[PDB]
Design a protein around this nucleic acid. Structure first.
Ligand code: MG
Ligand code: MG
Ligand code: MG
Ligand code: MG
Ligand code: MG
Ligand code: MG
Ligand code: MG
Ligand code: MG
Length: 1310
RNA sequence: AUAACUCAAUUUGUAAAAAAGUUUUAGAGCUAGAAAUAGCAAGUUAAAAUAAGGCUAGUCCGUUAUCAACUUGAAAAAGUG
DNA sequence: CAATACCA
DNA sequence: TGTGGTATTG
DNA sequence: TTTACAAATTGAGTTAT
């Protein structure tokens, strides 16, 4: 009797019920509650709206951060624990004074001076050590016995802020020396061509505070006859951390583009050295050394002969220079600009020095402020020099201290420990403990150190001790934990669910892939009548001769190196492989290079061992654990080989198990899968064939060896945003089926709808750096500017034309074109992957295809450079160069066209599967499923084109009806489509020369609706005779449906979750709005939080005390229960409310009111709950469809439409009138309405297009939900808010089911 | 439609870490003047907190997902036009 | 208790 | 961006 | 801000059920 239409979105689900003749039914539904109404008429069409479902990222970030905080605190605790006794002998209350430092003097239990406990000693301390780094340096260098408190302070300061762990090994803090060394190995390599390094200050040039490239050019500038692109130049550039290509230096064909910071460098250099010889290893090693020394050089900036604390010395340098320069600046301003002195050094709100030190001004803002002040005056040259160096008036605690490795803090810590252990025995006994406190780090592959109460943890205990940094290796089972880290995420073999999957780089797996690809190769020569398979002997010969001697195997190598040299063929045609084999034996060659024993690798006896080794290399990444794991094989190799093996690492997992590949044997033959791959008589059967062959036993054994709705939907792949929509639409369908008397629909039609700046700037920076371009230095940008498409494309194309080979102009982007690589008539692609910036799109070649062969030939190399620089992707490149591969065939065109109407997205298929499996649950006499309900999926293009062809226009900003209308149209068009063409069920319905034909077929699939293109008035199906569409009266029905005033729009009521409030930590203030950051921290003294989020409101009817005498007065109001207060209120609401001050609370009248709670008042006017103290607009403006269509036409053959617009331009005043009466009845914002009427009367002189486009903006005044601002023409209209929820307390509350068809209304007159 | 492999791109989920920022306190302000108020000297650092907190007491957990109303029911869930 | 600006 | 909390203004 | 890891998914290709 009926079908269902569905439109699934990220913030909405549209639904509709249709009958046989495309009508939507209307029904009487019962109304519950305490009001007048017993029932209500409802149309069976509507839409559910909801806030976006969120990902789990933020929660994760905060969680991990939390853990870091508690662990840091623990570190400090360990330290103090060690210091306890001996500190008790010296100062009874030192640690207590430390821990209560935050407290106001009034609340302190001890003296207000932290370190010593009296004014004179404290002032003395600060006088001697103005910063902590002074004390650090003192304690590192001096030999005197020191106060235990200062020792503690230094150690604790080093431990609390320890630095990163991005560098492995030990650091011992130079550049001149290693530079001389590089020159040495260079000149000792190139005797005929020497370099003169005399008078060259390598230290000042390389450690200079400049960009790496500039410094490179500075160094090269001191070398005559030497250029930056030369070998030595590339070595220095390697040391500066650029991306040099040593190809041109060594006449290579393979580009030696090698970056030092890149993780693959250590293998890139082996790959390169294997080509030019091993004499050159010295050189590159020296280069790396110099690179390290340079890195240490941006960090330290102080001679290592003065002290063993270069870092602290550097901070002290910052201090001294800040002092001197501050004195200088003060004097200068005193002399020359005496009127600006107060502004600069006294006002915190002005970004001067005062705002820099005492205000919220950053170093960048401060530098911005004094730049023209320094420029305007005289004697401020070097100050400007330091300003451009970002080295002017530096603080010591700065944003750029993230460079500091933990090894140097560790260096100072160790030095201090060694220094003072000569006086304090406990420092001697606890040196390594403290060092480990700074050093220890929980491995990422271990996870939280939990004991059964963490859903995130996986680590296994080797003993039931409390875990400390010092007993970690003995208590934690590192191996089992590291293994569990991987195995809890990896797949099992689908075919054998109890078997683990092999490593992707396993030798056996690669043998499998190579043989599987090899088995389906065929060849023909002159003498043979038909192409033949490769035999077992041939396959083995090819493997041994080609696959075991070459990294990759090409077709040419197959022909020449095999078919010519062995089979004696001068010519042969091959069909199994393209250009070169996809599979290869990479691990075989890796291990061949490492262990240097082909016979060992070829011996079948060593199979298990090699598999275990590769497994170890894959499963782990820790070199120590890898080493311990490989110990059982230490007797088989030399120590050198053992270390090389240690360095070798792999990642990634296969798809099949070892038991599937080479374990299970066929009962009759006794052969495994791999055995069949290597030899199978005449029929070289595939893995797919072996697995499905009824004459073998594999299929038998495999078939032998073989989640609620919410969980199922949650486990799908996709954004949680769309998943929310999926669950919601399932629930909607359930309710609709319930409404229809528990009868199932005939059909269900579903349609599914289709920061970054940082990533963009990153892409462009790395790309340009790879390209070695200067365009970034010549044309500097900001990430916010890259939001512009043409500019982003400009930088991605290195400021060149993508079709012509010429430079473009940044200032002329408005004259250029953005062309689509594959025409948008075929591929609806809006991404950068299908877009390109060119001067004129006519230069692309033909507009009917991929860019011409001419262009491809002209630009291929440039595109290659862009590819290697990651400025374009592989897909973009392949699309750009398709013309040399025959361009777009007709098959491709037909395919694209059919893809424009046939959904292929996996997630939608999952939706259809869920619905289908929920509806059809019965099987027939042949044990086959009975499909009572047909689930159809369409793309949005069908309904969109339908609306555009018969003028059922959509304007989103008028109201929310368009979702529901979309669902309806989905149902109609879908059912009609399959009723007309029952053959297309394979394409649209869930479950189990010609190119031109398919093209024209799919391109005119929707022609049966049209009356002329010339077709009959009544459209039926040829075989059945059943009428599918009546052009005379069905369009009328659709038009009546879209014109229906009442449509069930329901905003999902949701409890608010998340953070308690704004994170801002505010200063103290006299306001009850402030919230304590800790239990005893009175916010009037300490400041705290502000602006909490209400989880849900609550209706309270009770009494409150009034006046001095506390007279009980009856009240009725809304109380906002915050997220922080929720658990307490839910534990015992009465006690909570009474604690709030309420008395004699009517417990049974307590009503929970989440956000978006709906209330109705007088003239059909509605409000939604935005908070406990604010409301949202609750009504929908049902504008008559004539006005919607008129607006659509006016705001955007065409001449008939223009004539319609001009003949009906009086519609404007009518639309304004409708908006006006609606606003007067429901919105109640007279000031804004006056502004609107006035502004509209102002621009009544403007063209019709413009007036329509700006009338579009006016609907935000009447839109459902939260009020917002909008510009009519140039007049901004500020939002009017509903800052009181009082009127709601006497309105009628409305409880709605998911469709809004079931209602319970409560008159809040109590 | 499905399976294995090659190349690339995207998305989701988890763990271990760094540097800032903010807040209160501690870095004896000095003179003149009864008084607000002038004139000048100064500033770079540190401690502690970083969701209130919880029991399961761990070097653990605390911001995702999920949620009309009513009848029941501790609760989970069923039922109701 | 408006119009209303600023904030995260 | 959008939108609910807050102090200020009257 | 940095490091380490797994899984789908899309889409250009080779071979199959
Ligand atoms: Mg805490
Ligand atoms: Mg030179
Ligand atoms: Mg600071
Ligand atoms: Mg190939
Ligand atoms: Mg590994
Ligand atoms: Mg939530
Ligand atoms: Mg800080
Ligand atoms: Mg509801």
């Amino acid at each position: 009797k009926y079908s269902i239409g569905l439109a699934i979105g990220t913030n909405s689900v549209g639904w509709a019920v249709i009958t046989d003749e495309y009508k939507v039914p209307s029904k009487k539904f019962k109304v519950l509650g305490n009001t007048d109404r017993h029932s209500i008429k409802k149309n069976l069409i509507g839409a559910l709206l909801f806030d976006s479902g969120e990902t789990a990222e933020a929660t994760r970030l905060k969680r991990t951060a939390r853990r870091r905080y508690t662990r840091r605190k623990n570190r400090i605790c360990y330290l103090q624990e060690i210091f306890s006794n001996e500190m008790a002998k010296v100062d009874d209350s030192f640690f207590h004074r430390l821990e209560e430092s935050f407290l106001v003097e009034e609340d302190k239990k001890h003296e207000r001076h932290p370190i010593f406990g009296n004014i004179v000693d404290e002032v003395a301390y600060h006088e001697k050590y103005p910063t902590i780094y002074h004390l650090r340096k003192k304690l590192v260098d001096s030999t005197d016995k020191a106060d235990l408190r200062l020792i503690y302070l230094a150690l604790a300061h080093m431990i609390k802020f320890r630095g990163h762990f991005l560098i492995e090994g030990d650091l011992n803090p130079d550049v001149d020396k290693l530079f001389i060394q590089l020159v040495q190995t260079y000149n000792q390599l190139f005797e005929e061509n020497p370099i003169n390094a005399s008078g060259v200050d390598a230290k000042a040039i390389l450690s200079a505070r400049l960009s790496k490239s500039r410094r490179l050019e500075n160094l090269i500038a001191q070398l005559p006859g030497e250029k930056k692109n030369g070998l030595f130049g590339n070595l220095i550039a390697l040391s500066l951390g650029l991306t040099p290509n040593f190809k041109s230096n060594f006449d290579l064909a393979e580009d030696a583009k090698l970056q030092l910071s890149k993780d693959t460098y250590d293998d890139d250099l082996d790959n390169l050295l294997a080509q030019i010889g091993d004499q050159y290893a010295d050189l590159f090693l020296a280069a790396k050394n110099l690179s390290d020394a340079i890195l240490l050089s941006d960090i330290l900036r102080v001679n290592t002969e003065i002290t063993k604390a270069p870092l602290s010395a550097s901070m002290i340098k910052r201090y001294d220079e800040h002092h001197q320069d501050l004195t200088l600046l003060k004097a200068l301003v005193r002399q020359q600009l005496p009127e600006k002195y107060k502004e600069i050094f006294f006002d915190q709100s002005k970004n001067g020095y005062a705002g820099y030190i005492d205000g919220g001004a950053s170093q960048e803002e401060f530098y911005k402020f004094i730049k023209p002040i320094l420029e305007k005056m005289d004697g401020t040259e070097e100050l400007l020099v330091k300003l451009n160096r970002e080295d002017l008036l530096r603080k010591q605690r700065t944003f750029d201290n993230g460079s500091i490795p933990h090894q140097i803090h560790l260096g100072e810590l160790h030095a201090i420990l060694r220094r003072q252990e000569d006086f304090y025995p406990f420092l001697k006994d606890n040196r390594e403990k403290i060092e480990k406190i700074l050093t220890f780090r929980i491995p990422y592959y271990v996870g939280p150190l939990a004991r059964g109460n963490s859903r995130f943890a996986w680590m296994t205990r080797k003993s039931e001790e409390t875990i400390t940094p010092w007993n970690f290796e003995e208590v934690v089972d590192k191996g089992a934990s590291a293994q569990s880290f991987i195995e809890r995420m990896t797949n099992f073999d689908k075919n054998l669910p109890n078997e683990k999957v092999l490593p992707k780089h396993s030798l056996l797996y690669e043998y499998f892939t190579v043989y599987n690809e090899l088995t389906k190769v065929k060849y023909v020569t002159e003498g043979m009548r038909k192409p033949a398979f490769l035999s077992g002997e041939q396959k083995k010969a090819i493997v041994d001769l080609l696959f075991k001697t070459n990294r990759k195997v090409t077709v040419k190598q197959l022909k020449e190196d095999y078919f010519k040299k062995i089979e004696c063929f001068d010519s042969v045609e091959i069909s199994g492989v393209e250009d070169r084999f996809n599979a290869s034996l990479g691990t075989y060659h890796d291990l061949l290079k490492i262990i240097k024993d082909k016979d060992f690798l070829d011996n079948e006896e060593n199979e298990d061992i090699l598999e275990d080794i590769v497994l170890t290399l894959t499963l782990f990444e820790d070199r120590e654990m890898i080493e311990e794991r490989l110990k059982t094989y230490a007797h088989l190799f030399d120590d050198k080989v053992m270390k090389q093996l240690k360095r070798r690492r792999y990642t990634g997992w296969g798809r099949l198990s070892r038991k599937l590949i080479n374990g299970i044997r066929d009962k009759q033959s006794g052969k495994t899968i791999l055995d069949f791959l290597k030899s199978d008589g005449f029929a070289n059967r595939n893995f797919m064939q072996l697995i499905h062959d009824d004459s073998l036993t594999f299929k038998e054994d495999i078939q032998k060896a073989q989640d609620s709705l919410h969980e199922h939907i949650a486990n799908l792949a996709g954004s949680p945003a769309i998943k929310k929509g999926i669950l919601q639409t399932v629930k909607v369908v359930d309710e609709l089926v319930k409404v229809m008397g528990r009868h199932k629909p005939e059909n269900i039609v579903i349609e599914m709808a289709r920061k970054n700046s940082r990533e963009r700037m990153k892409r462009i920076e790395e790309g340009i750096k790879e390209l070695g371009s200067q365009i970034l230095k010549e044309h500097p940008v900001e990430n916010t500017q890259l939001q512009n498409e043409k500019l982003y494309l400009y930088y991605l194309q290195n400021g060149r034309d993508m079709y012509v080979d010429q430079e473009l102009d940044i200032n002329r982007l408005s004259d250029y074109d953005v062309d689509a690589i594959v025409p948008q008539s075929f591929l609806k692609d809006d991404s950068i992957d299908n877009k390109v910036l060119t001067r004129s799109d006519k230069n692309r070649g033909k507009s009917d295809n991929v860019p011409s062969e001419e262009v491809v030939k002209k630009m291929k190399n440039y595109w290659r450079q862009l590819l290697n620089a990651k400025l374009i992707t592989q897909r973009k490149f392949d699309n750009l160069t398709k013309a040399e591969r025959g361009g777009l065939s007709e098959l491709d065109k037909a395919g694209f066209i059919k893809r424009q109407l046939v959904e292929t997205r996996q997630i939608t298929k999952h939706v259809a599967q869920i619905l289908d499996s929920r509806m059809n649950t019965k099987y027939d006499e042949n044990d086959k499923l009975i499909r009572e309900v047909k689930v159809i999926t369409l793309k949005s293009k069908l309904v969109s084109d339908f609306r555009k062809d018969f003028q059922f226009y959509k304007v989103r900003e008028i109201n929310n009806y368009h979702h529901a209308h979309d669902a309806y149209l989905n149902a109609v068009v879908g059912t009609a489509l399959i009723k007309k063409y029952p053959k297309l069920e394979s394409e649209f319905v869930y479950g189990d020369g010609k190119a031109t034909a398919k093209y024209f077929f799919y391109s005119n699939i929707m022609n049966f609706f049209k009356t002329e293109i010339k077709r009959p008035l009544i459209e039926t199906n040829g075989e059945t005779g059943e009428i599918v569409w009546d052009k005379g009266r069905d369009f009328a029905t659709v038009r009546k449906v879209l014109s229906m005033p009442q449509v069930n729009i329901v905003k999902k009521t949701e409890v608010q979750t998340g953070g308690f409030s704004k994170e801002s930590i505010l200063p103290k203030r006299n306001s009850d709005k402030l919230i304590a950051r800790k239990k005893d921290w009175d916010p009037k003294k300490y400041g705290g939080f502000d602006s909490p989020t209400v989880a849900y409101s609550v209706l309270v009817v009770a009494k409150v005390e009034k006046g001095k005498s506390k007279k009980l007065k009856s009240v009725k109001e809304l109380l906002g229960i915050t997220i922080m207060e929720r658990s307490s209120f839910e534990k015992n609401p009465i006690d909570f409310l009474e604690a709030k001050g309420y008395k004699e609370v009517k417990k049974d009248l307590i009503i929970k009111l989440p956000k978006y709670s709906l209330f109705e008042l007088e003239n059909g006017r509605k409000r939604m709950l935005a908070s406990a103290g604010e409301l949202q607009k609750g009504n929908e403006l049902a504008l008559p469809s004539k006005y919607v269509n008129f607006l659509y036409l006016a705001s955007h053959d065409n001449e008939q439409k223009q004539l319609f617009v001009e003949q009906h331009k009086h519609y404007l005043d009518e639309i304004i009138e409708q908006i006006s009466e609606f606003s007067k009845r429901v919105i109640l914002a007279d000031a804004n309405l006056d502004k609107v009427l006035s502004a509209y009367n102002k621009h009544r002189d403007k063209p019709i297009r413009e007036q329509a486009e700006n009338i579009i903006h006016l609907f935000t005044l009447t839109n459902l939900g939260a009020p917002a601002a909008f510009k009519y023409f140039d007049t901004t209209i500020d939002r009017k808010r509903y800052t009181s929820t009082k009127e709601v307390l006497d309105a009628t509350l409305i409880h709605q089911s998911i469709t809004g068809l079931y209602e319970t209304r409560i008159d809040l007159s109590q």
